[PDB]
Amino acid sequence: YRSLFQDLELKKERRVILDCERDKVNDIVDQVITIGKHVKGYHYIIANLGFTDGDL
Amino acid sequence: NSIQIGGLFPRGADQEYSAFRVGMVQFSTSEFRLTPHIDNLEVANSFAVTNAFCSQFSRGVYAIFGFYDKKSVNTITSFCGTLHVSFITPSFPTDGTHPFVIQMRPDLKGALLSLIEYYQWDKFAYLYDSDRGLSTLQAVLDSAAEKKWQVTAINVGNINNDKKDETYRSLFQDLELKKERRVILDCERDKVNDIVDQVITIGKHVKGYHYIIANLGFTDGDLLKIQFGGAEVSGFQIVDYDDSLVSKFIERWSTLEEKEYPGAHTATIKYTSALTYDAVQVMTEAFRNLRKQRIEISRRGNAGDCLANPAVPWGQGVEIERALKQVQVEGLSGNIKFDQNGKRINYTINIMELKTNGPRKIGYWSEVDKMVLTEDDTSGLEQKTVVVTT
Amino acid sequence: NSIQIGGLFPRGADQEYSAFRVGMVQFSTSEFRLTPHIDNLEVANSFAVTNAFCSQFSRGVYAIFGFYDKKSVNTITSFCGTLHVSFITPSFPTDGTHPFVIQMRPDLKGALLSLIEYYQWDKFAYLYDSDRGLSTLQAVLDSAAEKKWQVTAINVGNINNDKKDET
């Protein structure tokens, strides 16, 4: 993941649409927390019906 | 030879009690047996402290040992300053000089000062908890007078566990008005971890922020949770794990069964417990020094009431302190020496920093040599400063 | 109905004890009269404090009176809290809600902050002794954060009286 989001930094992406399973959503959000890219200036879109179901 | 001593401990200080028994095992000798008198009374109640104190005084103990509250420190100083009973302590150093008050915890403030001196901060927020005493705050303010600092001190410690939440978000929002990038936390490890977690949740651990954790437990707390945030983090370590004696300590410390010694079966250890384990060594070293001096100390154990008026000090106990301060041996904290006031001297503390690979030392702060960088430091961005012919 | 009471007057506080005598005069009544147990001991010495305290406790006095040091506040609070014995003081108020504690000093900090607001100050020095406690310091700093101020606090009180001039 850290290798992955670093790659996003080269494009300096501020905008990402995740499309993953309830569990993968959790792990991804967690890693985003650890790398801290949940700060203002980023944005996300969770492509599933479980958006409320997720532990946001 | 039986040698009775006290054994005060706060409830929930299990690691320290375990390490204490470890001290009893490691340094036991046929020449004499130490005779601990364990008491797990709460530190919060000064009256209870008085109770245990008079109780062990009835025990006729030649020494007493344990932690103390900021609320309780004056009591211990009063009695030990009264009955001339020596008292070693892991806890924070006394703000004032006292007789019979040995203290295991190195003064920390000067290293903090030099640390700020290195980063050359002009202005910063300063959180603190009342329980360790505000003396550090008095120090940083005194420095602020000379060094011209616009420090913003705040106590977080009044907050309830029940609503320790919005109070934080409200707090850091207040920091935003000054747009502070630089804050020194000064809290106990639990509230340390909580505040760190809140910093995580609010996300203010990205690059461009910085922190300074004012305690010896800088490695003891989790930092993995914030290691990757990009904000720089640095602290202190009284206990180098790299030390051969220390790694040797780890070799067995891991081995101990969790049942018999809870909290002990781990790769690491809190510095405080380490200070306890060292303290027992110091005590025993002192008693070994006494018998060699052939100094009789067999005072009657029937000391009677500690409230006795007039209170009469027993002289051999007064002599004991004279040995205690003069004692010098290695410990988990490394070399230890005392002043005539019983404060620690000739000590030095490692300056930790967290890095993406993991935590690392960068230098050491002597009390006399102040800050001293290691040569371990590498280099900056060498672009070969692009040579340009003309 | 004579009623035994404690008496813990710090040494050198003569005017206070005299005022106590006047108080005994003004309110004396046939229904009951107080029975002071007057003592003049150092307020700093928590040991002696506990000594006289348990001494009057042996008397089983139904009330106790005297001052307390910042060093000793924890003592008397710990005892009245433990022994459930009433006590009265004119010493500076505790920061916490302690049972069986009476105190004649109104809190002064809010009026102080108010006075600050009246002058609409933004920056100032703040000399302080450590004796009455740092509560006012914590307060003025708290207001300093919110009101956006520039405190310059200094602990004058630790200075030795011998060279007390050069400092």
Side-chain angles (χ1 to χ4, degrees):
Chain A
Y1 293 132
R2 295 181 181 84
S3 177
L4 177 63
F5 292 93
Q6 181 176 354
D7 296 345
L8 298 175
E9 288 301 321
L10 298 178
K11 292 178 178 178
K12 295 176 179 177
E13 292 299 319
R14 299 286 176 267
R15 295 176 180 174
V16 175
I17 295 172
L18 297 176
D19 184 2
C20 292
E21 297 177 352
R22 178 67 174 86
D23 295 344
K24 297 293 185 292
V25 172
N26 291 335
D27 290 344
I28 289 171
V29 171
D30 288 345
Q31 293 300 322
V32 174
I33 294 172
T34 301
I35 64 176
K37 294 183 182 298
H38 53 77
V39 295
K40 183 190 293 179
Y42 289 143
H43 190 280
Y44 295 92
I45 295 170
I46 306 302
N48 60 345
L49 295 175
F51 177 79
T52 60
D53 290 344
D55 185 5
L56 275 66
Chain B
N1 297 131
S2 178
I3 298 171
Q4 294 179 336
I5 59 173
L8 272 65
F9 297 98
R11 297 181 184 175
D14 299 345
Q15 186 174 356
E16 295 78 357
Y17 177 77
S18 295
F20 174 78
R21 292 174 59 189
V22 173
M24 286 298 295
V25 174
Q26 180 59 57
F27 298 94
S28 63
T29 188
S30 296
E31 296 176 351
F32 55 87
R33 183 183 65 197
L34 276 67
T35 303
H37 192 278
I38 307 302
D39 283 338
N40 293 337
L41 274 65
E42 182 66 14
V43 67
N45 189 342
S46 297
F47 170 79
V49 175
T50 304
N51 299 337
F53 182 82
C54 294
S55 177
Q56 295 181 338
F57 182 79
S58 296
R59 190 64 61 184
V61 295
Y62 298 96
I64 294 172
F65 174 79
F67 298 169
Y68 63 86
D69 182 356
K70 181 186 67 63
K71 294 177 179 178
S72 65
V73 58
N74 289 329
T75 299
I76 302 302
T77 54
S78 179
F79 283 88
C80 295
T82 299
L83 295 177
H84 293 76
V85 175
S86 296
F87 182 81
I88 303 98
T89 184
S91 297
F92 60 91
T94 61
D95 290 343
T97 61
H98 298 83
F100 300 91
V101 180
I102 304 302
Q103 52 185 16
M104 294 295 101
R105 185 181 300 179
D107 187 3
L108 180 63
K109 55 179 289 181
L112 189 147
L113 296 175
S114 297
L115 178 62
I116 295 173
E117 293 172 350
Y118 173 77
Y119 288 87
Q120 297 178 336
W121 295 359
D122 60 353
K123 179 181 74 180
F124 55 86
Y126 176 79
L127 291 177
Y128 62 90
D129 185 4
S130 62
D131 291 346
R132 285 199 292 268
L134 278 68
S135 178
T136 61
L137 174 58
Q138 297 176 336
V140 299
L141 294 176
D142 292 345
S143 297
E146 182 178 2
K147 298 295 180 65
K148 295 176 179 177
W149 291 345
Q150 293 180 336
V151 181
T152 302
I154 294 170
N155 189 341
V156 68
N158 293 337
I159 296 171
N160 64 344
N161 292 336
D162 292 344
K163 189 179 74 180
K164 55 181 176 182
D165 183 68
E166 296 177 351
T167 59
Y168 293 132
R169 295 181 181 84
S170 178
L171 178 64
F172 292 93
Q173 181 175 354
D174 295 345
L175 298 176
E176 288 301 321
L177 298 178
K178 292 178 178 178
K179 295 176 179 177
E180 293 300 319
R181 299 287 176 267
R182 295 176 180 174
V183 176
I184 295 172
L185 297 177
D186 184 2
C187 293
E188 186 64 18
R189 182 183 181 276
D190 295 344
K191 289 186 173 73
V192 170
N193 291 336
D194 289 345
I195 290 171
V196 173
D197 290 345
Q198 292 300 322
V199 174
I200 296 171
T201 301
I202 63 176
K204 294 183 183 299
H205 55 77
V206 297
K207 184 189 293 179
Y209 288 144
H210 191 281
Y211 295 92
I212 295 170
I213 306 303
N215 60 345
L216 294 175
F218 178 79
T219 59
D220 292 344
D222 183 4
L223 275 70
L224 301 176
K225 58 181 67 179
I226 57 100
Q227 186 174 356
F228 303 97
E232 292 178 349
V233 174
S234 300
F236 306 100
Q237 189 59 58
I238 187 65
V239 178
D240 174 66
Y241 287 88
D242 293 345
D243 287 341
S244 63
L245 187 146
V246 174
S247 178
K248 183 188 294 179
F249 180 84
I250 303 302
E251 291 180 349
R252 182 181 63 198
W253 179 259
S254 62
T255 58
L256 291 175
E257 184 178 2
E258 184 176 1
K259 294 176 179 177
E260 185 179 0
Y261 297 100
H265 181 63
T266 57
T268 59
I269 182 170
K270 290 180 177 178
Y271 67 92
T272 60
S273 297
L275 295 176
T276 299
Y277 174 79
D278 292 344
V280 175
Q281 180 178 353
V282 176
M283 294 175 70
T284 301
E285 178 65 15
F287 290 99
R288 292 173 62 184
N289 291 334
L290 267 64
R291 179 182 61 80
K292 184 185 66 62
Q293 291 176 335
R294 191 182 297 276
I295 296 171
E296 180 277 334
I297 61 172
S298 297
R299 179 62 65 182
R300 178 183 293 174
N302 292 337
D305 185 4
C306 55
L307 298 175
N309 191 341
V312 56
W314 59 280
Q316 297 82 359
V318 176
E319 185 67 15
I320 294 171
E321 184 179 5
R322 299 180 183 175
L324 297 174
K325 296 176 179 177
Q326 294 173 335
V327 175
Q328 182 174 354
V329 295
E330 294 303 319
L332 296 176
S333 64
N335 190 30
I336 295 171
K337 291 183 69 65
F338 296 155
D339 63 353
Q340 68 286 0
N341 290 336
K343 182 178 179 180
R344 292 184 59 177
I345 61 173
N346 195 30
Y347 68 91
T348 299
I349 296 171
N350 291 334
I351 296 99
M352 293 301 296
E353 291 184 348
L354 177 61
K355 301 299 181 181
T356 301
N357 63 346
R360 182 182 63 196
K361 291 182 293 296
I362 62 169
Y364 61 91
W365 186 89
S366 175
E367 66 183 346
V368 296
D369 295 346
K370 295 176 180 177
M371 179 176 284
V372 175
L373 276 66
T374 57
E375 296 176 351
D376 297 344
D377 294 344
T378 59
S379 64
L381 295 176
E382 54 183 340
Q383 298 299 102
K384 296 175 180 177
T385 182
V386 179
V387 176
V388 175
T389 187
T390 186
Chain C
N1 298 131
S2 179
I3 298 169
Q4 294 178 336
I5 62 169
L8 279 70
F9 294 94
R11 297 181 183 175
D14 294 346
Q15 185 175 356
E16 294 75 352
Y17 175 77
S18 295
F20 174 78
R21 296 172 63 186
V22 176
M24 293 299 293
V25 174
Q26 291 295 100
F27 303 99
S28 64
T29 186
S30 296
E31 293 177 350
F32 57 90
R33 290 185 298 277
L34 274 63
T35 302
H37 190 280
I38 304 302
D39 287 340
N40 291 338
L41 279 69
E42 295 178 352
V43 66
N45 189 339
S46 298
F47 171 78
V49 171
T50 300
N51 294 338
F53 179 83
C54 290
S55 178
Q56 296 178 337
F57 181 81
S58 297
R59 301 295 180 85
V61 294
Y62 302 95
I64 296 171
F65 180 79
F67 297 166
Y68 61 83
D69 182 4
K70 177 177 176 291
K71 290 179 177 178
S72 66
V73 57
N74 289 328
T75 299
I76 307 302
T77 53
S78 182
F79 280 95
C80 294
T82 299
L83 296 178
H84 291 78
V85 176
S86 295
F87 174 79
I88 296 97
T89 185
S91 297
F92 61 89
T94 62
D95 294 346
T97 59
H98 299 83
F100 295 91
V101 175
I102 304 303
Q103 55 185 18
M104 293 294 102
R105 287 171 62 87
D107 186 3
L108 180 62
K109 59 186 290 179
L112 193 147
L113 298 174
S114 298
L115 179 62
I116 296 170
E117 293 177 350
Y118 175 77
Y119 290 88
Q120 293 178 337
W121 289 2
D122 55 354
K123 177 183 64 63
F124 55 87
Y126 178 77
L127 298 178
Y128 62 89
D129 184 3
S130 62
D131 289 346
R132 285 200 293 269
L134 281 67
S135 177
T136 61
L137 172 61
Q138 297 175 336
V140 296
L141 292 174
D142 290 344
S143 296
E146 182 178 2
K147 303 303 181 182
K148 179 177 73 180
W149 287 348
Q150 295 175 335
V151 176
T152 304
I154 294 171
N155 189 341
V156 63
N158 294 338
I159 294 170
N160 60 345
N161 293 337
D162 293 344
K163 61 181 66 180
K164 182 183 76 179
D165 183 68
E166 299 173 351
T167 61

